[PDB]
Amino acid sequence: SHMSFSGKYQLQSQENFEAFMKAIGLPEELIQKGKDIKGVSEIVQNGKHFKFTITAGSKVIQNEFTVGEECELETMTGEKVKTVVQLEGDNKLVTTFKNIKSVTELNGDIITNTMTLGDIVFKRISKRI
Incomplete structure (x- = not known):
């Protein structure tokens, strides 16, 4: 039995925002402005x-996709990329684009997103509101 990911979640803590956003080329001014924002994201699953x-620092980023089909995604820099998102197990959405692997895992009321960009692990932990 798979879990639904539907909900609204607020960022609780995150690790490596600065390193990760600098690596992907976010303007420094948006890094500074964005790093202390604990924004609310929403997932609608049908x-x-x-x-x-998603509230990603200073940007709202909207994405839409169907599991196992090619989709266009906007990245945290608003670049558009083509990839496919898969469900892995009962509680994880996983995708790879550019040189980034992204795992989004729901445990109860806590959603954890980890994005690995070479040796950088950017992790965001959000809690259901």
């Missing part, structure tokens, strides 16, 4: 179809 509205 079956295998998902709509995410």
Whole structure:
């Protein structure tokens, strides 16, 4: 039995925001302005179809995709990329784009996103509101 990812979540803590955002080329001014924002994200899941509205520092980023099909995503820099998101197990959405691996895992009321960019691990932990 798979879990639904639907909900609104607020950022609780995060590790390596600065390193990660600098590596992907976010303007320094947005790094400074964005690093202390604990924003609210929303996931709407209809079956295998998902709509995410994510607060990523100073930007709202909206994505939409169906598991196992090619999708266009906007990255945290608003670059557009083509990839595919898969469900791994009961509680994890996993995708790879550019040189980034992204795992989003729901445990109860806590959603953890880890993005690995070479040796940088950017982790964000958010809690259901």
